[PDB]
Structure 1
């Protein structure tokens, strides 16, 4: 039941395609970046957005 929805997924792809050489492969320093490069209303959502961003980058540097 861990399926991210099209709010988290679509936002994370838009946040990679214009901030690629600022995001690491680490979650703890990615969610600190999402407070600066994005406006997200709730703390629970930006942890989900930054987590899927970190998951996408692990499969970007693979291929």
Structure 2
């Protein structure tokens, strides 16, 4: 049928995970570099890999795809998770507490500015 196997799926995934800036969306210009970048013993096999590489390239072009992570993706992924807000949680983020929370602070012997708001219906 139309489904392809692991030997072309992992090979295509491995190439993209390593050779991302060298290949692109077009099949014809991806065939020319796939047969010189990776030793592929068959004309039919190399055709299949180049087709699955450009297939994932089209998918990568619109949003990240689970499973594949190249150097450019993971580098920008880090920049996303280093972000920190400027404002603090302590100030107006737009001390709420209850009776039991409020006396907990007093049992612990701490003085904090907190408004005792009981369960109002």
TM-score range, shorter chain: over 0.9
Q: How far does residue 20 in structure 1 lie from its aligned partner after superposition?
A: 0.3
- What's the CA shift for 1:35? 1.3
* Residue aligning to 2:6: 6
CA distance in 2, matches of 1:19, 1:10: 14
User: How big is the shift at 1:36?
Assistant: 1.3
Structure 1 portions without partners, runs of 5+ = none
Q: How many residues align?
A: 63
Runs of 4+ in 1 over 2 A off after TM superposition: none
Q: Deviations over 1:11-57 (max 9, x none)?
A: 00000011000111000000100111100001000000000000000
TM (norm. structure 2) is 0.50
Distance in 2 between residues matched to 1:57 and 1:37, nearest whole Å: 17
Higher relative contact order (CA 8 A, sep 6+): 1
List runs of 5+ in structure 2 lacking aligned partners: 62-119
Offset, 1:9: 0.3
TM-score (norm 1): 0.94
Cα root mean square deviation, aligned: 8.3
Larger Rg: 2
1:40 and 1:23 map into 2 onto residues whose CA distance is 16
In structure 1, C-alpha distance between the alignment counterparts of 2:36 and 2:6, rounded to whole Å:
22
